[PDB]
Amino acid sequence: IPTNFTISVTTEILPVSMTKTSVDCTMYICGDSTECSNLLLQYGSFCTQL
């Protein structure tokens, strides 16, 4: 049988969220070029999904 007690404090760390982000297709893929974008329009709708 115990005859005495102690009171202790413990700490716990928990992540809750991560940094938001956003990307742009046209400038990343086709750098300040018009022909590249004109021919990128024919690749479908990947960018909408992203």
Query: What does the alpha-carbon distance between residue 20 and residue 27 come to, in Å, rounded to a whole number?
Result: 20
**Shortest Cβ 27–a second copy spacing (Å):** 20
Q: Give the ranges where the chain is alpha helix by DSSP (H).
A: 25-29, 34-40, 46-49
Candidate segments 2-10, 11-19, 23-31, 40-48, binder of a second copy by CB under 8 A: 40-48
Tell me: does residue 44 bind a second copy (CB under 8 A): yes
Q: How many residues bind a second copy (CB under 8 A)?
A: 6
Query: What does the alpha-carbon distance between residue 17 and residue 34 come to, in Å, rounded to a whole number?
Result: 38
Residues making contact with a second copy (CB under 8 A): 39, 42-45, 49
